[PDB]
Design an enzyme around this catalytic site. Structure first.
Site, short mmCIF file in Angstrom:
data_model
loop_
_atom_site.label_atom_id
_atom_site.label_comp_id
_atom_site.label_asym_id
_atom_site.label_seq_id
_atom_site.Cartn_x
_atom_site.Cartn_y
_atom_site.Cartn_z
CD1 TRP A 1 34.44 43.73 31.28
CD2 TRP A 1 32.31 43.42 31.94
NE1 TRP A 1 34.31 44.00 32.64
CE2 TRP A 1 32.88 43.86 33.05
CE3 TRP A 1 30.77 43.51 32.05
CZ2 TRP A 1 32.30 43.90 34.36
CZ3 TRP A 1 30.19 43.59 33.09
CH2 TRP A 1 30.89 43.67 34.47
CB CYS B 1 31.84 38.50 41.31
SG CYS B 1 30.82 37.38 40.47
CD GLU C 1 37.57 44.11 34.86
OE1 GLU C 1 38.27 43.75 35.62
OE2 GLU C 1 36.67 43.28 34.46
N1 LIG Z 1 38.33 40.61 35.53
C1 LIG Z 1 37.26 40.20 35.49
N2 LIG Z 1 37.26 38.76 35.67
C2 LIG Z 1 36.11 38.26 35.52
N3 LIG Z 1 36.09 36.56 35.95
C3 LIG Z 1 35.00 38.88 35.24
C4 LIG Z 1 35.09 40.17 34.76
N4 LIG Z 1 36.10 40.66 34.85
C5 LIG Z 1 33.92 40.89 34.37
C6 LIG Z 1 32.73 39.93 33.74
C7 LIG Z 1 33.12 38.25 34.02
C8 LIG Z 1 33.93 37.86 32.71
N5 LIG Z 1 33.65 36.42 32.38
C9 LIG Z 1 34.94 36.03 31.65
C10 LIG Z 1 36.19 35.64 32.55
C11 LIG Z 1 37.27 35.15 31.96
C12 LIG Z 1 37.12 34.69 30.55
C13 LIG Z 1 38.41 34.13 30.13
O1 LIG Z 1 38.24 33.10 29.19
N6 LIG Z 1 39.58 34.35 30.44
C14 LIG Z 1 41.07 33.82 29.95
C15 LIG Z 1 41.88 34.72 29.23
C16 LIG Z 1 42.06 36.06 30.09
C17 LIG Z 1 43.48 36.72 29.48
O2 LIG Z 1 43.81 36.31 28.23
O3 LIG Z 1 44.09 37.62 30.03
C18 LIG Z 1 41.42 33.44 31.27
O4 LIG Z 1 41.33 33.96 32.40
O5 LIG Z 1 42.37 32.36 31.17
C19 LIG Z 1 36.13 34.82 29.74
C20 LIG Z 1 35.00 35.56 30.34
N7 LIG Z 1 33.66 38.24 35.32
C21 LIG Z 1 32.86 38.13 36.21
C22 LIG Z 1 33.27 37.15 37.36
C23 LIG Z 1 32.89 36.00 37.55
N8 LIG Z 1 33.33 35.02 38.28
C24 LIG Z 1 32.70 33.64 38.29
C25 LIG Z 1 31.94 33.34 39.79
C26 LIG Z 1 31.03 32.48 39.33
O6 LIG Z 1 31.68 31.14 38.89
C27 LIG Z 1 30.58 33.22 38.11
C28 LIG Z 1 29.54 34.10 38.14
O7 LIG Z 1 28.31 33.41 38.34
P1 LIG Z 1 27.14 33.85 39.49
O8 LIG Z 1 26.39 35.04 39.19
O9 LIG Z 1 26.14 32.80 39.27
O10 LIG Z 1 27.82 33.87 40.77
O11 LIG Z 1 31.62 33.85 37.38
C29 LIG Z 1 34.41 35.34 39.25
O12 LIG Z 1 34.73 34.42 40.04
N9 LIG Z 1 34.96 36.52 39.10
C30 LIG Z 1 34.43 37.73 38.40
O13 LIG Z 1 35.07 38.54 38.18
#
Ligand SMILES: Nc1nc(N)c2c(n1)CC[C@@H](CNc1ccc(C(=O)N[C@@H](CCC(=O)O)C(=O)O)cc1)N2Cc1cn([C@H]2C[C@H](O)[C@@H](COP(=O)(O)O)O2)c(=O)[nH]c1=O
Ligand SMILES: Nc1nc(N)c2c(n1)CC[C@@H](CNc1ccc(C(=O)N[C@@H](CCC(=O)O)C(=O)O)cc1)N2
Ligand SMILES: O=c1[nH]c(=O)n([C@H]2C[C@H](O)[C@@H](COP(=O)(O)O)O2)cc1CO
Ligand code: NA
Ligand code: NA
Ligand code: NA
Lengths: 264, 264
Positions: A80, A146, A58
């Site tokens: 994504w 974020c 990423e």
């Molecule tokens: N690298 C990174 N990390 C992220 N999480 C992320 C992206 N890229 C890009 C897009 C989205 C991806 N969404 C996902 C994130 C995680 C999983 C997932 O299931 N992962 C597993 C497996 C991973 C593995 O195998 O290694 C696992 O992890 O075990 C699926 C989808 N996001 C944004 C993001 C959101 N949020 C919070 C704040 C608020 O709760 C809400 C926003 O809502 P709002 O607009 O209302 O504020 O999402 C954060 O805190 N940080 C962030 O980067």
């Protein structure tokens, strides 16, 4: 990590119940800060296994200025997926703002190139900033950034970085967000012949989702372990020429991973 | 204030020497955070006399979207004189970005109206943000924004705000920055029928200028006095309709002023 588990306990103990965009519900605090001395070790959470494969690809994708998820697919990276359009586009999110921020008059500013040149020519500058919070393009972005805003700083030959994260899912997001920016500091430091200093994390709305509580209690029952060490195996010609294979994490001995459902 | 004097002492104890743009030299740290519960009192520094009149007028000017010092001169406020051009213009600094951030497709975004409407209609939103860091217009500004990015938050009927200040002149600038955003929180809370919560201040390059050291230590020898109290005497129909005379500061009993030279 000690500071991470302290934050997680603070949200439990002091967070207020909020309804949120997703309808899931959170406990939330506002305003927090942590500091990781990167010479103490790479700040990868050890109280659950965190997979860096997706983080690294990423970050490399961000650095290429890319907002189409094809590159991520080619490397079996799916994080994504939800938000890409039928053509695999996300609009002008991180990569676009980092590499080609559009001026009102049709020019572009490469913020990464700018920061590299500031670090190499004006390291005392108080203006060494990358912003993804392009107010004029939020409406076009698949998701509002974020990690809104980060700043670099140089003192005594060490490179530090501070991230402002407007919204932080403490359980699912924060471990990966800390690792991403810590990795970037090492890469920037290598390209500018600097040592690594501190990664300072600052949060706005810092929350635990109401369906992450069992997972939180499990993690808080675990003791952290000494931090691993990031090895960069190859020094590329520029910050834009790194490869997944260039990074090795030595001595990462985490507790088992913890699964939890993401709030869409 | 306790928090302010603790910050001064931390820069002195933990800062490192840096040259700077202005040629003066600083002692600086990177990354700090402190909180002011605005129900404890209005956070106007008491260990030296600070002049609220300029703070109020400057904020009303920002909120009008103005970036020429003529209004400030009409009200005998000279704090921006050193950076204005021959016609009094500063370029598209704070007021312009707050009220009319220019997009690439010819639009302008009124961020203050946006956050007022979010607080009224969607106060749980995690993206109630105002940014002055318009990358594409920095080169037109007389100074790059120091108080660069701020975020609002609502819990338990109280409005909080966090400021990211990427560069902080601790002795001369910070007392004005704290009071300015505290005043803005009171005004916003009034317009949204909320009580006041916390002002969270977060710093990037947080520094004492070399020629502020005798003044800083003089101030550190003084005991903080009780915080004054802010009384607002009218509810205008909009956030843009306040007047200087609507504000009264009660119980402000500062130690004597301490003069120090501004680094241009
Ligand atoms: N690298 C990174 N990390 C992220 N999480 C992320 C992206 N890229 C890009 C897009 C989205 C991806 N969404 C996902 C994130 C995680 C999983 C997932 O299931 N992962 C597993 C497996 C991973 C593995 O195998 O290694 C696992 O992890 O075990 C699926 C989808 N996001 C944004 C993001 C959101 N949020 C919070 C704040 C608020 O709760 C809400 C926003 O809502 P709002 O607009 O209302 O504020 O999402 C954060 O805190 N940080 C962030 O980067
Ligand atoms: N280096 C730098 N650059 C900037 N543009 C910048 C700042 N710092 C910090 C805040 C802001 C500029 N506001 C101010 C605030 C205060 C004064 C001032 O004169 N204070 C003394 C009087 C000094 C004397 O009498 O000798 C007092 O309080 O009595 C001037 C400007 N912006
Ligand atoms: O509000 C302010 N608060 C404040 O502390 N400053 C200080 C921070 C720096 O010492 C200086 C800006 O110079 P520089 O861009 O190189 O960081 O002015 C400047 C402003 C202007 O708004
Ligand atoms: Na906190
Ligand atoms: Na508009
Ligand atoms: Na007005």
């Amino acid at each position: 990590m000690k500071q991470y588990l302290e934050l997680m306990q603070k949200v439990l103990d002091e967070g207020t119940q909020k309804n949120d965009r997703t309808g899931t519900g959170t406990l939330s605090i506002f305003g927090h800060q942590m500091r990781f001395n990167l010479q103490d070790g790479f700040p990868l959470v050890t109280t659950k296994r965190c997979h860096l494969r997706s983080i690294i690809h990423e970050l490399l994708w961000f650095l290429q200025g890319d907002t189409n998820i094809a590159y991520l697919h080619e490397n079996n990276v799916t994080i994504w997926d939800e938000w890409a359009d039928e053509n695999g586009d996300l609009g002008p999110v991180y990569g676009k703002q980092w590499r080609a921020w559009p001026t009102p008059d049709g020019r572009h500013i490469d913020q990464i190139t700018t920061v590299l040149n500031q670090l190499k020519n004006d390291p005392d500058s108080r203006r060494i900033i990358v912003s993804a919070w392009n107010v004029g393009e939020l409406d076009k972005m698949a998701l509002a950034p974020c990690h809104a805003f980060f700043q670099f700083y140089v003192a005594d030959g060490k490179l530090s970085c501070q991230l402002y994260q407007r919204s932080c899912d403490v359980f699912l997001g924060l471990p990966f967000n800390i690792a991403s920016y810590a990795l970037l500091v090492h890469m920037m430091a290598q390209q500018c012949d600097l040592e690594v200093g501190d990664f300072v994390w600052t949060g706005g709305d810092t929350h635990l989702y109401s369906n992450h509580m069992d997972q939180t209690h499990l993690q808080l029952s675990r003791e952290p372990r000494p931090l691993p060490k990031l090895i960069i195996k190859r020094k590329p010609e520029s910050i834009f020429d790194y490869r997944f294979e260039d990074f090795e994490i030595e001595g990462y001995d985490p507790h088992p991973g913890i699964k939890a459902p993401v709030a869409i």
